Tab-separated table of C-alpha atoms in Angstrom:
chain	number	residue	atom	x	y	z
A	1	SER	CA	94.884	-8.528	35.109
A	2	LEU	CA	93.484	-8.359	31.582
A	3	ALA	CA	90.668	-10.658	32.708
A	4	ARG	CA	89.481	-8.214	35.368
A	5	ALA	CA	89.604	-5.314	32.923
A	6	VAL	CA	87.512	-7.278	30.414
A	7	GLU	CA	84.968	-8.121	33.117
A	8	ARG	CA	84.580	-4.416	33.875
A	9	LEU	CA	83.982	-3.611	30.201
A	10	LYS	CA	81.433	-6.416	30.053
A	11	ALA	CA	79.625	-5.034	33.112
A	12	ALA	CA	79.273	-1.578	31.568
A	13	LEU	CA	77.910	-3.055	28.330
A	14	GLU	CA	75.445	-5.074	30.400
A	15	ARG	CA	73.676	-1.978	31.728
A	16	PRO	CA	70.894	-0.080	29.922
A	17	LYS	CA	72.368	2.648	27.753
A	18	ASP	CA	72.383	6.237	29.015
A	19	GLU	CA	75.174	8.761	28.446
A	20	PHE	CA	76.931	7.816	31.687
A	21	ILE	CA	76.980	4.081	31.004
A	22	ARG	CA	78.080	4.851	27.446
A	23	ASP	CA	80.969	7.030	28.588
A	24	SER	CA	81.909	4.536	31.308
A	25	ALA	CA	81.961	1.741	28.711
A	26	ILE	CA	84.255	3.835	26.510
A	27	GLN	CA	86.635	4.637	29.372
A	28	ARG	CA	86.810	0.923	30.179
A	29	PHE	CA	87.515	0.014	26.568
A	30	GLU	CA	90.396	2.491	26.739
A	31	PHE	CA	92.237	0.889	29.618
A	32	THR	CA	91.359	-2.638	28.469
A	33	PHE	CA	92.786	-2.081	24.980
A	34	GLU	CA	95.888	-0.638	26.596
A	35	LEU	CA	96.298	-3.627	28.906
A	36	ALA	CA	95.568	-5.964	25.985
A	37	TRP	CA	98.240	-4.875	23.497
A	38	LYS	CA	100.639	-4.676	26.424
A	39	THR	CA	99.907	-8.322	27.182
A	40	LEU	CA	100.385	-9.218	23.515
A	41	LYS	CA	103.804	-7.599	23.768
A	42	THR	CA	104.700	-9.546	26.906
A	43	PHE	CA	103.687	-12.694	25.025
A	44	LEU	CA	105.401	-11.944	21.707
A	45	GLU	CA	108.654	-10.957	23.413
A	46	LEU	CA	108.819	-14.495	24.754
A	47	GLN	CA	108.909	-16.095	21.310
A	48	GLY	CA	111.533	-13.533	20.325
A	49	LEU	CA	109.281	-10.972	18.663
A	50	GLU	CA	109.405	-7.185	18.907
A	51	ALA	CA	106.281	-5.099	19.564
A	52	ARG	CA	106.879	-1.567	20.918
A	53	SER	CA	103.599	-0.493	19.276
A	54	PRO	CA	99.978	-1.701	19.318
A	55	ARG	CA	99.903	-2.088	15.533
A	56	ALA	CA	103.120	-4.130	15.637
A	57	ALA	CA	101.841	-6.191	18.575
A	58	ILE	CA	98.575	-6.959	16.813
A	59	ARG	CA	100.406	-7.781	13.594
A	60	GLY	CA	102.636	-10.148	15.530
A	61	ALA	CA	99.723	-11.856	17.215
A	62	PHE	CA	98.496	-12.714	13.711
A	63	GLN	CA	101.847	-14.118	12.600
A	64	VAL	CA	102.473	-16.335	15.630
A	65	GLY	CA	99.064	-17.818	14.925
A	66	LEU	CA	97.960	-16.562	18.351
A	67	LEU	CA	94.967	-14.568	17.090
A	68	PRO	CA	93.213	-15.160	13.768
A	69	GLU	CA	93.549	-12.702	10.905
A	70	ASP	CA	90.832	-10.336	12.127
A	71	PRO	CA	91.004	-6.799	10.699
A	72	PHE	CA	88.661	-5.604	13.453
A	73	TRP	CA	91.670	-5.441	15.738
A	74	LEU	CA	93.155	-2.666	13.647
A	75	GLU	CA	89.719	-1.092	13.592
A	76	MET	CA	89.819	-1.279	17.386
A	77	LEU	CA	93.202	0.470	17.382
A	78	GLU	CA	91.611	3.389	15.515
A	79	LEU	CA	88.716	3.524	17.970
A	80	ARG	CA	91.122	3.783	20.888
A	81	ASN	CA	92.709	6.672	18.998
A	82	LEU	CA	89.322	8.354	18.495
A	83	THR	CA	88.529	8.200	22.203
A	84	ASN	CA	90.619	11.359	22.573
A	85	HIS	CA	88.032	13.381	20.670
A	86	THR	CA	84.895	12.160	22.414
A	87	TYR	CA	84.020	15.758	23.191
A	88	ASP	CA	82.128	15.006	19.964
A	89	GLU	CA	79.186	13.035	21.335
A	90	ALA	CA	78.157	11.671	17.928
A	91	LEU	CA	81.642	10.121	17.826
A	92	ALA	CA	81.173	8.715	21.344
A	93	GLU	CA	77.991	7.003	20.153
A	94	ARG	CA	79.821	5.595	17.121
A	95	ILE	CA	82.590	4.113	19.306
A	96	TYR	CA	80.093	2.739	21.837
A	97	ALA	CA	78.267	0.936	19.031
A	98	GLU	CA	81.438	-1.113	18.332
A	99	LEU	CA	82.200	-2.023	21.932
A	100	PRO	CA	80.184	-5.240	21.935
A	101	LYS	CA	82.319	-6.527	19.052
A	102	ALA	CA	85.394	-5.230	20.874
A	103	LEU	CA	84.481	-7.254	23.973
A	104	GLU	CA	84.188	-10.351	21.783
A	105	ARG	CA	87.795	-9.952	20.615
A	106	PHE	CA	89.113	-9.383	24.140
A	107	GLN	CA	87.426	-12.570	25.400
A	108	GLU	CA	88.802	-14.591	22.479
A	109	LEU	CA	92.204	-13.154	23.379
A	110	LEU	CA	91.914	-14.289	26.997
A	111	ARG	CA	91.165	-17.858	25.921
A	112	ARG	CA	93.923	-18.115	23.310
A	113	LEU	CA	96.232	-16.438	25.800
A	114	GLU	CA	96.003	-19.210	28.372
M	1	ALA	CA	84.180	21.737	19.741
M	2	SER	CA	82.633	23.531	22.712
M	3	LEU	CA	84.743	23.611	25.879
M	4	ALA	CA	81.665	24.828	27.739
M	5	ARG	CA	79.761	21.735	26.644
M	6	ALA	CA	82.644	19.445	27.686
M	7	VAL	CA	82.789	21.140	31.086
M	8	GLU	CA	78.999	20.796	31.434
M	9	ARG	CA	79.183	17.074	30.686
M	10	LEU	CA	81.876	16.662	33.364
M	11	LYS	CA	79.806	18.718	35.792
M	12	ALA	CA	76.707	16.583	35.177
M	13	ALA	CA	78.604	13.392	36.058
M	14	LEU	CA	80.138	14.860	39.204
M	15	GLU	CA	76.729	15.920	40.524
M	16	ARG	CA	75.432	12.341	40.434
M	17	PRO	CA	75.485	9.754	43.221
M	18	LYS	CA	78.731	7.865	42.849
M	19	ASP	CA	78.955	4.266	41.646
M	20	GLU	CA	81.537	2.465	39.494
M	21	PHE	CA	79.892	3.553	36.245
M	22	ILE	CA	79.360	7.183	37.221
M	23	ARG	CA	82.975	7.161	38.415
M	24	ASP	CA	84.428	5.914	35.165
M	25	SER	CA	82.342	8.284	32.964
M	26	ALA	CA	83.508	11.244	35.076
M	27	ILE	CA	87.111	10.145	34.504
M	28	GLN	CA	86.282	9.774	30.797
M	29	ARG	CA	84.812	13.280	30.718
M	30	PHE	CA	87.845	14.695	32.498
M	31	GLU	CA	89.898	13.186	29.674
M	32	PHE	CA	88.336	14.911	26.667
M	33	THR	CA	87.685	18.105	28.615
M	34	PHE	CA	91.393	18.357	29.514
M	35	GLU	CA	92.295	17.463	25.933
M	36	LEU	CA	89.998	20.237	24.700
M	37	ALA	CA	91.236	22.646	27.382
M	38	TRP	CA	94.910	22.555	26.422
M	39	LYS	CA	94.029	22.686	22.728
M	40	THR	CA	92.052	25.797	23.656
M	41	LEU	CA	95.082	27.249	25.456
M	42	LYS	CA	97.248	26.504	22.426
M	43	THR	CA	94.900	28.383	20.093
M	44	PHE	CA	94.797	31.344	22.473
M	45	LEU	CA	98.562	31.539	22.976
M	46	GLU	CA	99.084	31.342	19.217
M	47	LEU	CA	96.696	34.265	18.735
M	48	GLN	CA	98.859	36.191	21.230
M	49	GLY	CA	101.903	35.543	19.056
M	50	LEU	CA	103.357	32.788	21.276
M	51	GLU	CA	103.920	29.059	20.712
M	52	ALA	CA	102.985	25.891	22.592
M	53	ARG	CA	103.803	22.479	21.160
M	54	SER	CA	102.735	20.537	24.239
M	55	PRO	CA	100.073	20.595	26.962
M	56	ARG	CA	102.873	21.443	29.418
M	57	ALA	CA	103.932	24.392	27.284
M	58	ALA	CA	100.323	25.501	26.753
M	59	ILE	CA	99.711	25.620	30.521
M	60	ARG	CA	102.915	27.494	31.351
M	61	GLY	CA	102.208	29.925	28.550
M	62	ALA	CA	98.729	30.495	29.954
M	63	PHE	CA	100.354	31.457	33.241
M	64	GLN	CA	102.811	33.761	31.476
M	65	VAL	CA	100.076	35.657	29.628
M	66	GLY	CA	97.689	35.736	32.577
M	67	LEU	CA	95.069	33.590	30.896
M	68	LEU	CA	95.328	31.449	34.056
M	69	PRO	CA	96.224	32.203	37.681
M	70	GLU	CA	99.572	30.732	38.713
M	71	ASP	CA	98.107	27.457	40.031
M	72	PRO	CA	100.369	24.405	40.428
M	73	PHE	CA	97.265	22.230	40.368
M	74	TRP	CA	96.987	22.552	36.596
M	75	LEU	CA	100.316	20.791	36.229
M	76	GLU	CA	98.996	17.979	38.443
M	77	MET	CA	95.921	17.768	36.196
M	78	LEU	CA	98.239	17.153	33.260
M	79	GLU	CA	99.671	14.257	35.257
M	80	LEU	CA	96.226	12.898	36.127
M	81	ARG	CA	95.361	13.020	32.419
M	82	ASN	CA	98.321	10.739	31.637
M	83	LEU	CA	97.256	8.334	34.408
M	84	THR	CA	93.715	7.768	33.108
M	85	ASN	CA	95.255	5.373	30.609
M	86	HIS	CA	96.176	2.967	33.409
M	87	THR	CA	92.812	2.864	35.186
M	88	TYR	CA	92.495	-0.912	34.899
M	89	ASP	CA	93.816	-0.379	38.421
M	90	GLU	CA	90.661	0.699	40.289
M	91	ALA	CA	92.683	2.118	43.176
M	92	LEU	CA	94.103	4.592	40.677
M	93	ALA	CA	90.641	5.249	39.260
M	94	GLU	CA	89.420	6.104	42.758
M	95	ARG	CA	92.404	8.407	43.241
M	96	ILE	CA	91.710	10.233	39.966
M	97	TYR	CA	87.992	10.578	40.606
M	98	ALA	CA	88.609	12.249	43.978
M	99	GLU	CA	90.555	15.026	42.213
M	100	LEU	CA	87.887	15.857	39.641
M	101	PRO	CA	85.843	18.328	41.650
M	102	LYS	CA	89.060	20.344	41.863
M	103	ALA	CA	89.697	19.831	38.145
M	104	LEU	CA	86.176	21.106	37.349
M	105	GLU	CA	86.857	24.335	39.262
M	106	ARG	CA	89.896	24.954	37.101
M	107	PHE	CA	87.993	24.332	33.878
M	108	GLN	CA	85.220	26.687	34.995
M	109	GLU	CA	87.751	29.406	35.841
M	110	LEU	CA	89.350	28.945	32.408
M	111	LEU	CA	85.929	29.394	30.765
M	112	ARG	CA	85.402	32.662	32.670
M	113	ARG	CA	88.841	33.979	31.732
M	114	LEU	CA	88.425	33.065	28.060
M	115	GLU	CA	85.464	35.380	27.521
M	116	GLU	CA	86.985	38.683	28.629
Z	1	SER	CA	106.151	17.165	1.392
Z	2	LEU	CA	109.026	16.327	3.719
Z	3	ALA	CA	111.044	15.158	0.722
Z	4	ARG	CA	110.779	18.522	-1.024
Z	5	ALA	CA	111.632	20.252	2.264
Z	6	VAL	CA	114.797	18.230	2.701
Z	7	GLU	CA	115.517	18.971	-0.950
Z	8	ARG	CA	115.462	22.733	-0.281
Z	9	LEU	CA	117.670	22.375	2.793
Z	10	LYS	CA	120.217	20.468	0.703
Z	11	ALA	CA	120.172	23.047	-2.094
Z	12	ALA	CA	121.159	25.719	0.431
Z	13	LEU	CA	123.959	23.745	2.095
Z	14	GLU	CA	125.598	23.054	-1.259
Z	15	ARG	CA	125.956	26.766	-1.993
Z	16	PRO	CA	129.170	28.532	-0.930
Z	17	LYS	CA	128.772	30.028	2.542
Z	18	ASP	CA	127.888	33.707	2.974
Z	19	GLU	CA	125.441	35.203	5.502
Z	20	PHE	CA	122.448	35.107	3.158
Z	21	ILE	CA	123.000	31.499	2.262
Z	22	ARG	CA	123.588	30.867	5.973
Z	23	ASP	CA	120.315	32.375	7.083
Z	24	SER	CA	118.318	30.705	4.299
Z	25	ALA	CA	119.709	27.322	5.380
Z	26	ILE	CA	118.649	28.046	8.979
Z	27	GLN	CA	115.218	29.046	7.715
Z	28	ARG	CA	114.983	25.781	5.762
Z	29	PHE	CA	116.066	23.781	8.807
Z	30	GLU	CA	113.148	25.283	10.741
Z	31	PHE	CA	110.306	24.306	8.481
Z	32	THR	CA	111.978	21.005	7.604
Z	33	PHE	CA	112.271	20.057	11.283
Z	34	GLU	CA	108.694	21.226	11.784
Z	35	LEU	CA	107.372	19.111	8.928
Z	36	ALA	CA	109.663	16.388	10.268
Z	37	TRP	CA	108.359	16.009	13.812
Z	38	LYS	CA	104.746	16.283	12.612
Z	39	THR	CA	105.519	13.470	10.164
Z	40	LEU	CA	106.674	11.287	13.050
Z	41	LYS	CA	103.561	12.152	15.053
Z	42	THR	CA	101.315	11.085	12.200
Z	43	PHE	CA	103.285	7.817	11.985
Z	44	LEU	CA	103.230	7.015	15.720
Z	45	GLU	CA	99.511	7.684	15.985
Z	46	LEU	CA	98.979	5.239	13.146
Z	47	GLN	CA	100.931	2.683	15.228
Z	48	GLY	CA	98.543	3.394	18.087
Z	49	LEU	CA	100.867	5.614	20.107
Z	50	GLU	CA	100.567	9.186	21.338
Z	51	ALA	CA	102.882	12.008	20.275
Z	52	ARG	CA	102.024	15.102	22.307
Z	53	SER	CA	105.160	17.176	21.731
Z	54	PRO	CA	108.187	17.292	19.409
Z	55	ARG	CA	110.231	15.597	22.133
Z	56	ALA	CA	107.548	12.931	22.472
Z	57	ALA	CA	107.469	12.213	18.741
Z	58	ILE	CA	111.269	11.930	18.595
Z	59	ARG	CA	111.373	9.651	21.626
Z	60	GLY	CA	108.517	7.631	20.139
Z	61	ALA	CA	110.315	7.147	16.847
Z	62	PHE	CA	113.198	5.751	18.889
Z	63	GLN	CA	111.319	3.095	20.846
Z	64	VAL	CA	109.137	2.150	17.890
Z	65	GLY	CA	112.252	1.593	15.800
Z	66	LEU	CA	111.399	4.313	13.284
Z	67	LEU	CA	114.522	6.343	14.047
Z	68	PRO	CA	117.799	4.891	15.344
Z	69	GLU	CA	118.643	5.876	18.923
Z	70	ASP	CA	120.587	9.027	18.014
Z	71	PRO	CA	120.932	11.690	20.748
Z	72	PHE	CA	121.575	14.196	17.986
Z	73	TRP	CA	117.863	14.325	17.302
Z	74	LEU	CA	117.318	15.979	20.681
Z	75	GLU	CA	120.117	18.438	19.901
Z	76	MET	CA	118.369	19.333	16.642
Z	77	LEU	CA	115.252	20.024	18.714
Z	78	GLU	CA	117.053	22.579	20.858
Z	79	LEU	CA	118.621	24.200	17.797
Z	80	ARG	CA	115.082	24.484	16.454
Z	81	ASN	CA	114.010	26.366	19.549
Z	82	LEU	CA	116.963	28.777	19.335
Z	83	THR	CA	116.332	29.796	15.715
Z	84	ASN	CA	114.446	33.022	16.490
Z	85	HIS	CA	117.197	34.272	18.811
Z	86	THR	CA	119.500	34.427	15.812
Z	87	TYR	CA	119.707	38.217	16.115
Z	88	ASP	CA	122.825	36.850	17.818
Z	89	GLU	CA	124.940	36.166	14.722
Z	90	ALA	CA	127.324	33.958	16.703
Z	91	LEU	CA	124.360	31.670	17.431
Z	92	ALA	CA	123.330	31.719	13.765
Z	93	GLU	CA	126.825	30.507	12.837
Z	94	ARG	CA	126.707	27.774	15.470
Z	95	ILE	CA	123.371	26.462	14.213
Z	96	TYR	CA	124.553	26.485	10.610
Z	97	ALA	CA	127.670	24.502	11.495
Z	98	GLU	CA	125.287	21.736	12.584
Z	99	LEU	CA	123.021	21.655	9.551
Z	100	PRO	CA	125.003	19.218	7.418
Z	101	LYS	CA	124.627	16.690	10.253
Z	102	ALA	CA	120.929	17.511	10.608
Z	103	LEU	CA	120.419	16.936	6.883
Z	104	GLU	CA	121.871	13.431	7.204
Z	105	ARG	CA	119.217	12.691	9.825
Z	106	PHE	CA	116.393	14.023	7.690
Z	107	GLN	CA	117.517	11.953	4.693
Z	108	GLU	CA	117.850	9.017	7.101
Z	109	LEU	CA	114.256	9.585	8.223
Z	110	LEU	CA	113.019	9.744	4.639
Z	111	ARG	CA	114.565	6.353	3.873
Z	112	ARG	CA	113.331	4.674	7.053
Z	113	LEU	CA	109.822	5.799	6.141
Z	114	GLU	CA	110.413	3.587	3.097
S	1	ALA	CA	120.944	42.576	21.338
S	2	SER	CA	120.728	45.544	18.936
S	3	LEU	CA	117.340	45.908	17.243
S	4	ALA	CA	119.082	48.355	14.920
S	5	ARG	CA	121.474	45.704	13.662
S	6	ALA	CA	118.556	43.310	13.188
S	7	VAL	CA	116.619	45.811	11.083
S	8	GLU	CA	119.838	46.482	9.156
S	9	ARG	CA	120.173	42.784	8.364
S	10	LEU	CA	116.600	42.683	7.167
S	11	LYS	CA	117.220	45.797	5.065
S	12	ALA	CA	120.344	44.320	3.406
S	13	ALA	CA	118.493	41.138	2.396
S	14	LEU	CA	115.618	43.090	0.859
S	15	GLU	CA	118.046	45.189	-1.173
S	16	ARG	CA	119.514	42.255	-3.069
S	17	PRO	CA	118.078	40.702	-6.253
S	18	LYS	CA	115.515	38.074	-5.346
S	19	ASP	CA	116.102	34.347	-5.676
S	20	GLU	CA	115.005	31.429	-3.499
S	21	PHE	CA	117.962	31.916	-1.133
S	22	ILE	CA	117.674	35.669	-0.665
S	23	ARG	CA	113.944	35.130	-0.191
S	24	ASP	CA	114.313	32.667	2.645
S	25	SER	CA	117.151	34.605	4.288
S	26	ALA	CA	114.874	37.680	4.389
S	27	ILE	CA	112.117	35.584	5.949
S	28	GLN	CA	114.549	34.235	8.562
S	29	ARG	CA	115.604	37.803	9.252
S	30	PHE	CA	112.007	39.008	9.578
S	31	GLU	CA	111.603	36.174	12.042
S	32	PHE	CA	114.299	37.226	14.543
S	33	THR	CA	113.716	40.932	14.003
S	34	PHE	CA	110.072	40.527	15.020
S	35	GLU	CA	111.154	38.486	18.012
S	36	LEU	CA	113.641	41.126	19.119
S	37	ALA	CA	111.234	43.945	18.358
S	38	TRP	CA	108.376	42.791	20.543
S	39	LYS	CA	110.758	41.893	23.365
S	40	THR	CA	112.187	45.369	22.963
S	41	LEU	CA	108.691	46.916	23.103
S	42	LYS	CA	108.081	44.760	26.160
S	43	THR	CA	111.062	46.238	27.968
S	44	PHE	CA	109.956	49.768	27.100
S	45	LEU	CA	106.331	49.307	28.206
S	46	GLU	CA	107.261	47.710	31.503
S	47	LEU	CA	109.515	50.632	32.429
S	48	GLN	CA	106.318	52.641	32.149
S	49	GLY	CA	104.444	50.195	34.313
S	50	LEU	CA	102.424	48.262	31.709
S	51	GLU	CA	102.036	44.513	31.204
S	52	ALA	CA	103.407	43.228	27.889
S	53	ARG	CA	103.498	39.453	28.154
S	54	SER	CA	102.975	38.647	24.494
S	55	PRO	CA	103.635	40.160	21.059
S	56	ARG	CA	99.935	41.026	20.881
S	57	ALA	CA	99.778	42.845	24.206
S	58	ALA	CA	103.100	44.548	23.471
S	59	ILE	CA	101.752	45.865	20.186
S	60	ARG	CA	98.498	46.965	21.861
S	61	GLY	CA	100.476	48.620	24.648
S	62	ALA	CA	102.643	50.409	22.109
S	63	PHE	CA	99.512	51.937	20.605
S	64	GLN	CA	98.086	52.927	24.003
S	65	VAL	CA	101.057	54.952	25.249
S	66	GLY	CA	101.486	56.440	21.803
S	67	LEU	CA	104.928	54.980	21.107
S	68	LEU	CA	103.558	53.610	17.826
S	69	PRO	CA	100.729	55.122	15.725
S	70	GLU	CA	97.489	53.173	15.281
S	71	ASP	CA	98.407	50.685	12.568
S	72	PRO	CA	96.552	47.419	11.812
S	73	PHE	CA	99.580	46.100	9.903
S	74	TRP	CA	101.373	45.273	13.157
S	75	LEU	CA	98.908	42.540	14.055
S	76	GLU	CA	99.183	41.305	10.487
S	77	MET	CA	102.948	41.106	11.022
S	78	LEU	CA	102.214	39.105	14.171
S	79	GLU	CA	100.266	36.626	12.031
S	80	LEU	CA	102.947	36.615	9.330
S	81	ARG	CA	105.328	35.537	12.093
S	82	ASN	CA	103.109	32.618	13.110
S	83	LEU	CA	103.140	31.592	9.423
S	84	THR	CA	106.926	31.545	8.932
S	85	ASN	CA	106.707	28.201	10.752
S	86	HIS	CA	104.782	26.672	7.849
S	87	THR	CA	106.969	27.799	4.973
S	88	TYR	CA	107.495	24.172	3.994
S	89	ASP	CA	104.797	25.461	1.658
S	90	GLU	CA	106.731	27.596	-0.817
S	91	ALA	CA	103.625	29.574	-1.744
S	92	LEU	CA	103.499	30.904	1.800
S	93	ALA	CA	107.168	31.914	1.609
S	94	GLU	CA	106.325	34.100	-1.396
S	95	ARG	CA	103.324	35.723	0.370
S	96	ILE	CA	105.389	36.458	3.460
S	97	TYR	CA	108.306	37.779	1.423
S	98	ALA	CA	106.026	40.138	-0.497
S	99	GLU	CA	104.985	41.664	2.843
S	100	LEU	CA	108.534	42.179	4.124
S	101	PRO	CA	109.268	45.549	2.508
S	102	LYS	CA	106.278	47.003	4.366
S	103	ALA	CA	107.331	45.186	7.536
S	104	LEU	CA	110.793	46.750	7.345
S	105	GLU	CA	109.109	50.174	7.329
S	106	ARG	CA	107.247	49.551	10.587
S	107	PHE	CA	110.462	48.253	12.170
S	108	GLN	CA	112.193	51.416	10.939
S	109	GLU	CA	109.448	53.605	12.410
S	110	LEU	CA	109.664	51.789	15.736
S	111	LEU	CA	113.405	52.457	15.858
S	112	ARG	CA	113.011	56.155	15.108
S	113	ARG	CA	110.361	56.444	17.830
S	114	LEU	CA	112.165	54.295	20.368
S	115	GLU	CA	114.681	57.123	19.991
């Protein structure tokens, strides 16, 4: 349920920032981005389009006019990749700073998805 | 990066009263700490003159050289690491969180072994 | 450069076969396969996927449509792992007999990387 | 597996005029000879009751029991082995190759002593 995931990410971002809320927001962005590109695949495969990768799935969402040409999605893909190295706290802060924008794109995806 | 610092961060989250947020940040800390731990095993094995192109290989090599006690729980940790990516399923997140105190013990033992 | 690596592997396999040419070809297959799987890893990560091990990267290239589903890639992986046991000259010969086929795959990879 | 035949192969490659092919064949030969050598040292040390679970510990063990004389080049050979995996960089192939004559000598000493 992409919607539930998104709600969890929104709840973390709602709380006052401390290192635990920050890290919890990042963990939630991780599973939500995963569930999201997976759902874009499920959707693109219907209209006969191949995904097999988050970059391909995002690129397809732009073609089938689903999502609008928003380069932040590819930026989000990089962030999800950087979440592996969050043993670097300065990096964790950098990712966290982009989560609000990230949440915006997930919510716009839920609408356009239904 | 400091493995000690990653382990400390994980320890700080496990000592706190549990709630959804504390839970998810502990899982998040288990993720980069594990990531850093196998990378640390890889570097060590390579200094010994051995190779490890995967976390699985790094762990088994660590057993082989004695850098880690033969402990089947490390292999399970590798599996838990792969599962963190599907935590949109809270039941799974609760199952992972309950294994972290055990995971912490392993990281701490690795830290001890590494400075000998 | 993977291209220059493949180039060196080809130069060796075009030479008439004698033990020195044989062992140099095996040596060139090692670093070429090494540079090869790391190349895939870099690619997959850019697509938003994870490539932990050589087997992961190969399997990832398959699903992502980078490499065609060719079981020979996995066989090349095992030959890679047997290369330092070549004190066994019979093994050395067996690996060499497979290099022309390996080369095809490398060249195939170079072209599918555009 | 005969470590003697491995050394011999390394020796034969280093005796021929150098060219890109002879160079890489010598590197490939250094590669399996070092593999066989440390495994061989491992067998020897464990018959004496010592742990030798890695090329490093084998080398260290060899120095302890006196099999091999204190020689820092052995650990350098260990590192040269780790490097053979990155010879997609031709400059590294030349560095490694330049160190092989010396390497052959240590392998030759090991043999003589293992005797």
